[PDB]
Amino acid sequence: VEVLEVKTITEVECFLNPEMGDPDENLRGFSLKLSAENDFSSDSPERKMLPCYSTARIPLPNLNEDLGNLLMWEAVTVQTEVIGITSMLNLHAGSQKVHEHGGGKPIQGSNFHFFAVGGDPLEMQGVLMNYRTKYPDGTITPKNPTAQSQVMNTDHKAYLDKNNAYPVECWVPDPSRNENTRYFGTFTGGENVPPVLHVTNTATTVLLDEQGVGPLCKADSLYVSAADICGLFTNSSGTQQWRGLARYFKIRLRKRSVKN
Amino acid sequence: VEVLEVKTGVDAITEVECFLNPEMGDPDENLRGFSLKLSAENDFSSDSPERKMLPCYSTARIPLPNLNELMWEAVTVQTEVIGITSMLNLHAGSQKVHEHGGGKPIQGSNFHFFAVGGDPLEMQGVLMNYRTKYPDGTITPKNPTAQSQVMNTDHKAYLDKNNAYPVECWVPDPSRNENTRYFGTFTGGENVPPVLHVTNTATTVLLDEQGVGPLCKADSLYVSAADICGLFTNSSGTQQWRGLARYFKIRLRKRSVK
Amino acid sequence: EVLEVKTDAITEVECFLNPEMGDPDENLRGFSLKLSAENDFSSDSPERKMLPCYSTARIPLPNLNLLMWEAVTVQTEVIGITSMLNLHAGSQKVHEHGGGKPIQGSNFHFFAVGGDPLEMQGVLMNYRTKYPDGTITPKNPTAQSQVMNTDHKAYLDKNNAYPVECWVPDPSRNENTRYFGTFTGGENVPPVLHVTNTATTVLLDEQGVGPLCKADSLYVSAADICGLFTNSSGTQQWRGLARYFKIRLRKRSVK
Amino acid sequence: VEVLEVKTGVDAITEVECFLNPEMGDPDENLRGFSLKLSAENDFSSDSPERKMLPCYSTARIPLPNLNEDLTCGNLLMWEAVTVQTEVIGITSMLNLHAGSQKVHEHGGGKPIQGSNFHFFAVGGDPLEMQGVLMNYRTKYPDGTITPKNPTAQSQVMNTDHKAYLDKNNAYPVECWVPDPSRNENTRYFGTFTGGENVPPVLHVTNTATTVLLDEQGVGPLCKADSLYVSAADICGLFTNSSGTQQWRGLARYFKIRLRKRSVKNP
Amino acid sequence: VLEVITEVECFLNPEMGDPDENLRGFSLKLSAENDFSSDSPERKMLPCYSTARIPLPNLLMWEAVTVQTEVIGITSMLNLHAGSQKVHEHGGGKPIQGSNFHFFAVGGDPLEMQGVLMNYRTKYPDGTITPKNPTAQSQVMNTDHKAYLDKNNAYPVECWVPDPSRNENTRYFGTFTGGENVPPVLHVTNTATTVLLDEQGVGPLCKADSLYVSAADICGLFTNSSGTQQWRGLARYFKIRLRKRSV
């Protein structure tokens, strides 16, 4: 695409639900109880235990009254926020007491907060803790992995082209691709890591690259992608479940001239 | 409203201030600023918190000098939490950290939140457990389903009543609040240290990218807060939320609109 | 009504303000008395030497009479932070054969500069606390004293009298003072303290006007509770350190 | 490794992309990216770590296209490294708490990777220059490592004898070597060490972040003999097996380096 | 100071106590629980400030303009196989952690220090320079305790801080982080410069053609398998850019 001038503005928005595994009709936003200590040679996680990347396609009207200069929608900025962070102030429901006569144990531990906005589906690279993991039906995971899949195996290239299918533990945004997508992620690992989450409607991320060009909706589609694993919920029984929250996107779009 | 020039001249600027008291539950006439002791381990199917156990959002409407329906535009807010040094009382009520030790400081999950707008703060409901049975005198997501544990777009409310909207049920709605600025941080965990800053030299600019602050519909300014500071641990081991008041000083200017 | 800056018109004053942690005996200057624990709210009578108090000094300036001294910048630093590397004196072993336990836990680092005494707001953990003789604490407190009670207005007008647990800088006043404080609470919080002679705080407000020394007096105020010292026995004491101030002042014309 | 002519001619830009694999020890064919289980409590006098227990620096030399038709000319062209974008690849793999790791408590999930970590990269036109420092000068290092020669007690602080080039992949143990701030005129390096048993790994990914490699004079690393050097160490923490044994976990590092042609005086 | 280049460099060794010929960079094992009335620490237990006078080429004086500095050998703490207590059964060695202090100064005169003591009654050992005639006021601010950092391996870190009321001709920077379980966090990069010019663009001036560097880099406590603890310190590198200034 040869990018020309800006045509001299609309907003689109989405609340993207998290895909934590949802083990029954009442535990929407939670994973299945976590298993532990599986040998690498016999590691068969159940589908409902594995959080997956969330994604939605926002369709836009074509701008070309007549198909040398075309018009495409261009993403300029995004406002994004994790939705429901105060829900972790419920220490009365389900959580193990911190000590005798105490309140419930807060959600805490390993967390991952990630979003992307592009004119194409997110491009991902596969990396596994254990190349021998047997992944369950309904997941899409690195094909024909080897030991090299525990470091970098360039065979593992995927599109985030399906909601609730690509396990977060198997896939990362690919920095060698995503020419038409901007992505941002923080991983914080550990048993006792405190969740730290900020809300403000005053924060904007600018999506323009070094040349002042945002993601271009080449096929009149805008892609939003997220993963928001807030930490682990510890049941009275001792079992643990991932908890996730929805993510809001508001994307400012403008019309961009291009050659064709 | 189409937004035109800032009006300057005599009486084209005002400053209003307020202290918003916290609404932590106030379980008896002597424990203002605390919640009732926390229950733990309720099954999701049998979760009935008492009103006095549930911290709520604080909110107040500040009347502004009457303009002929020019609007008042909020430009800056100075805000801080009041009484942070009260947590240096380790002689009263708190469980000793060990034999012959001082009392356990307040610590654990905390939430620090404030909003300034020309409309009531617009909130979105999200629940830990959609089956929680909330008590009389609370306003909570109406007729929740399983999706209410993630995003259910039916749960929209105005923060239109003090000491009524539980903090655990509601967040500011980023899809609305065109005319409000809000700021919050949640830090969760049993051992989280409270970290609180005071200074009269720090100001938050409420102007958007176009240089426009909250516009005060009907000459009313809305302030909102939640300052849950952590958990107080009694000698028995029981725990109570502790909250503190928030101060607001808001500078406004007259703005022409069409 | 503040006119022009006069351009021998720039003075410096410096001060080392000692902490007031309670000083339970003549050897334990800079420490509090052993902390008590688990007093019922209905019977909470803390001893004076257990309560750290705000430090303050009034620095008299030459009477220029109008012209007034205007405070423009402050350089400030907590003094003796390396003393906490002494883990051989008095502190409880971390484990068998281990060194002493570091000072750690709740801390409060605060300073103010103005041309009037620091204006303070009262707030209490427990309104029913019975405070000892020699302390100045909220008068006629109620349950609302545990949140915001506008009755509790004080001037920091006596050194070693206003307990830190009772009083905060009042953001509704202090027109003629700049104040800065950080509270970090918790059982095991690490003290984190920086020293540099390269850091300056500007005291000018939005209109370029610093505190104005009313009656030719400059006011410095501080509280530097570093955390808790844990004795061998398990008893705990607050530890505090002195604060340095170097303040640049200029002559300002006023109507 | 991709070397791409993005733009040609006088204002030519070349982008070099590459994924540098970590060198954590790889104790068996299935545990690529992990070390051998850590030993503990070896007396200083009797400290003989096994090869596969010792994470090493990663490095590679990337040959660039020759720019000089005539080597006699008064001016010669050199590739100059202007910017780098870099991140650690596969950080979400640590959300697998079902494989191999000690349960946090009865009926709990696996223990996350955590503890001491080191994240480091360098981009230069010469091999990264390193200074040796040892915890224990009397350590006996295994065949296949390059470690400080004839160490003394002074090697536990600063011994200026211990100078090396990072000139071999999977050979220089991280615990023996640091980048040398007294040299590296033609390299830019960046590292953070975080020590402690329960240190949480904190890793950021974004394709929007760029590090500028220009010095105060506006000059990037100059690729001597058309050679670009990439170096990394990304020890993420310790993986704790159900037995309680611990292994270093490392991840690959991505580099995207932007280069332009600088004219230099022919020496 | 009237009208307005050379670079000097130094690797300054730490002075942690060096309890024997093999344990260079470590202190003697720490004592605990001494009564304030009987606290007599051994010299080899006490980390001291490091310092070096750097002689410079002889109405013109050398003005220090910038410093690059970093702590040398931080990756050496990734040796968890040697001497340290296992974190649990079958586990690796315990990382160096706990109270740390990282400090450096650049000046045209020796660093000026102020004495402050945890315990004024401490009896300090021969070979140390500590506050003279300490009183209870030495636990807070006692203006008697003034010293020059004029001897390497003599002034215990626990007794002395940089004096903010002097040091007209020195720039200094320190962070103290206290606590049993504090993680060391150390950064390396050759891309970082500290500018030593004051608000009027004047750097430290080297009177007597001498440049003074000072450091303390106590990284944390090393826990032996026995449970005994020792300070670990590391060297600091300095590269200082000077220019000629007319006086």
Distance CA D148, CA D156 (A): 11
Cα-flanking dihedrals φ and ψ of residue B111, to 5°? -140, 125
- Experimental technique for the deposited model: X-ray
Q: How many residues does chain D have?
A: 267
Burial tier of D194 (Cβ tally within 10 Å: 0-12, 13-18, 19+): buried
And the tokens for C107? 């801390």
Instruction: Tell me the C-alpha distance between B227 and A86, whole Å.
Output: 12
Judge whether D263 and D12 are in contact, CB under 8 Å. Answer: no
User: Is-contact B107 B228, C-beta < 8 A?
Assistant: no
| Chain B residues inside the 8 Å CB shell of C189 | 193
Which residue in chain B is spatially nearest to C206 when comparing CA positions?
B201
Q: How many CA atoms lie within 13 A of B96 on its CB side?
A: 14
Count CB neighbours of A209 within 10 A: 14
Nearest to E69, CA basis, from E247, E185, E235: E235
Closest CA to B244 of C121, E86, E137, A176: C121
Q: Do E32 and C98 touch (CB under 8 A)?
A: yes
Residues 6+ positions from B69 with CB-CB distance below 8 Å = B218
| Interface touch D95/A169, C-beta < 8 Å | yes
Backbone angles phi, psi at B257, to 5 degrees: -135, 160
Chain D, window 178-237: residues with a beta carbon less than 8 angstroms from a chain E beta carbon: 178-179, 181-182, 184, 187-199, 216, 233, 235
Query: Rg of the Cα trace of chain E?
Result: 20
DSSP class of residue E76? G
Sign of CA dihedral D151, D153, D156, D157: negative
Closest-CA residue of chain B to C92:
B101
**CB–CB of A182/A144 below 8 Å?**
no
Strands D202-206 and A181-188: antiparallel
| E strands in chain D | 2-7, 13-20, 58-63, 75-88, 117-124, 129-132, 163-165, 177-179, 187-194, 202-206, 211-212, 227-240, 246-250, 253-265
Find chain B residues with C-beta within 8 A of A100's C-beta.
Answer: 237
CB-closest option in E36, E103, E178 to C89: E36
Using the Cα atoms of residue A89, residue A95, residue A98 and residue A101 in order, give the sign of their dihedral.
positive
The neighbouring-strand residues paired with E172 are: E105
In order of their start, the domains of chain A are: 1-260 (2.60.175.10)
Question: DSSP for C200-226?
Answer: -EE---TTS---B-GGGEEEEEEEEEE
DSSP string, D231-267: EEEEEEEEEEBTTS-EEEEE--EEEEEEEEEEEEE--
CB < 8 Å to E97, chain D:
195-197
The CA-based angle D180-D185-D191, given to 5 degrees, is 45
Closest CA to D249 of A189, E184, A50: A189
Is C102 close to E35, i.e. CB distance below 8 A? no
- Single out the residue of C141, C133, C191 nearest to residue C166, CA to CA: C141
* Closest chain A residue by Cα to residue B180: A201
| Rounded to 5°, angle at Cα C230 from C226 and C233 | 160
Cβ distance of A125 and D89 shorter than 8 Å: yes
Q: How far apart are CA A155 and CA A148, in angstroms?
A: 10
Mark yes or no for CB contact A103/B239 under 8 Å: yes
Question: What one-letter code names the amino acid at A252?
Answer: R
The pair of structure tokens assigned to C73 is 């910048």
Q: Which residues pair with A123 in a beta bridge?
A: A159
Contact predicate D180/D160, CB 8 Å? no
Picking from D95, D102, D103, D113 by the largest number of A CB atoms within 10 A of its own CB, the best residue to mutate is D95
d(CA E113, CA E163): 5
Residue carrying structure tokens 């052993």:
C34
Among E148, E69, E73, smallest CA distance to E104 is for E69
Resolution (A): 1.9
Please tell me which chains touch C, using 3 or more CB pairs under 8 Å as the contact test: B, E
Q: Which amino acid is at C38?
A: E
Nearest CA in chain B to C38: B93
How far apart, in whole angstroms, are the C-alpha atoms of residue C56 and residue D28? 67
Least CB-CB distance to A35: which of D98, D204, D250?
A: D98
DSSP state of C255: -
- Strand D75-88 and strand D211-212: pairing? antiparallel
Q: Residues 79 to 138 of A: which have CB under 8 A from any B CB? A: 79, 81, 83-108
Side chain identity, residue E49: Y
Residues of C in contact with E199 (CB under 8 A): 200
Residue of D nearest to E83 (CA): D41
Q: Which two tokens stand for residue D62?
A: 């990337």
Whether B237 and B1 have beta carbons less than 8 Å apart is answered as no
Q: In whole angstroms, give the CA distance from residue C206 to residue C203.
A: 10
Chain breaks in chain C (C to N over 2.5 A) after: 7, 65
Place of tokens 């030593």: E196
Q: How far is A111 from chain D (nearest CA, A)?
A: 8
Local structure of B53: helix, strand or coil: helix
| Nearest C-alpha in D relative to A240 | D108
The span from the CA of C110 to the CA of C97, in Å, is 37
Residue C228 contacts residue C21 (beta carbons within 8 Å): no
Q: Give dist(CA C9, CA A136) in Å, integer.
A: 80
Amino acid letter for position A166: Y
Q: Note whether B200 contacts C174, CB cutoff 8 Å.
A: yes
Cβ contact B24:B250 at 8 Å: no
Distance (Å, whole) CA B106 – CA C105 = 11
Q: What is the DSSP string of chain A?
A: -EEEEE---EEEEEEE--BS---STT-TTB-------B-GGG----GGGS-B-EEEEEE-----S---EEEEEEEEEEEEEEE-GGGGG--SBSBPBSSTT--BPPPBS-EEEEEEEESSPPEEEE--S-TT--PPTT----SS--GGGGS--TT-EEE--STT-SBGGGEEE-TTS-TTEEEEEEEE--SSPPPEEEEETT--EE---TTS---B-TTSEEEEEEEEEEEEEEBTTS-EEEEE-EEEEEEEEEEEEEE-
Residues preceding gaps in chain D (C to N > 2.5 Å): none
Are A210 and A248 in contact by the 8 Å Cβ rule? The answer is: no
Helix (H) or strand (E) holding E204: none
- What are the backbone angles phi and psi of residue C124, rounded to the nearest 5°? -125, 140
Neighbours of chain B (3+ CB pairs under 8 A): A, C
Q: How far, in Å, CA of C182 to CA of C169, rounded?
A: 12
Tokens of D20: 């540098």
The sign of the dihedral angle between the CA atoms of C226, E130, E30, E14 is: positive
- How many helices (H) and strands (E) would you count in chain B? 0, 14
Q: In D, which residues are within 8 Å of E234 by CB distance?
A: 133, 157
| Cα maximum dimension of chain A | 74
Q: How many CB atoms lie within 10 A of CB E128?
A: 15
Contact assignment for D237 to A189 by CB distance below 8 Å: yes
CB-CB neighbors (< 8 A) of C195 in chain E: 103, 161-162, 164, 172-176
φ/ψ of A86, rounded to 5, equals: -70, -15
Residues of chain B with C-beta less than 8 angstroms from the C-beta of A87: 126-128, 149, 168-169
What is the full DSSP assignment across C48-68?
GGGS-B-EEEEEE------EE
Strand partners, B59: B224
Q: Do chains B and C touch (3 or more CB pairs under 8 A)?
A: yes
CA dihedral over B203, B207, B212, B218, signed as positive or negative: negative
Q: Which of B38, B151, B177 sits opposite A246 (nearest CB)?
A: B151
Q: What share of chain B is helix, strand, coil (3-state, %, to 5)?
A: 10, 40, 50
Instruction: Tell me if residue B181 falls in helix, strand or coil.
Output: strand
Question: How does strand D58-63 pair with strand C67-79?
Answer: unpaired
- Taking the CA of residue B178 and the nearest CA in chain A, the distance in Å comes to 9
Residues D38 and E78: their CA atoms lie apart, in Å, by: 11
Asked if the Cβ–Cβ distance from A154 to D198 is below 8 Å, we say no
- Among residues E113, E115, E150, the alpha carbon closest in space to that of E130 is found at E115
Indicate the residue type of D16.
Answer: V
In the three-class reduction of DSSP (H, G, I as helix; E, B as strand; rest coil), residue C43 is classed as: helix
| D-to-E residue pairs, Cβ atoms closer than 8 angstroms | 189
Distance CA(E83)–CA(E92), nearest Å, equals 11
Looking at beta carbons, which residues of chain A come within 8 Å of D202?
A: 186-189
* Chain D: touching chains (3 or more CB pairs < 8 Å): A, E
Of C232, C175, C233, C170, give the one whose Cα is nearest residue C205. Answer: C175
Cβ-based neighbours of E189, under 8 Å, separated by 6 or more? D188, D189, D190, D191, E70
All residues of chain D having their beta carbon less than 8 Å from the beta carbon of residue A47 are: none
In the DSSP assignment, the letter for residue B37 is: P
Is E178 within 8 Å of C84 (Cβ atoms)?
A: yes
Contact E74, E135 (CB under 8 A): no
Q: Are B131 and B47 in contact (CB under 8 A)?
A: yes
Considering only the beta carbons, identify the residue of B150, B209, B236 that sits closest to A18: B150
What secondary structure does DSSP assign to D146-188, as a single string?
A: ---SS--GGGGS--TT-EEE--STTTSBGGGEEE-TTS-TTEE
Chain B residues in contact with A84 by the CB 8 A cut-off are: 124, 126-127, 150-151, 171
- Of A193, A177, A191, A184, which Cα lies nearest the Cα of A228? A184
- At B167, list the tokens: 């903090």
Using CB atoms, pick whichever of D22, D90, D201 lies closest to residue A189. D201
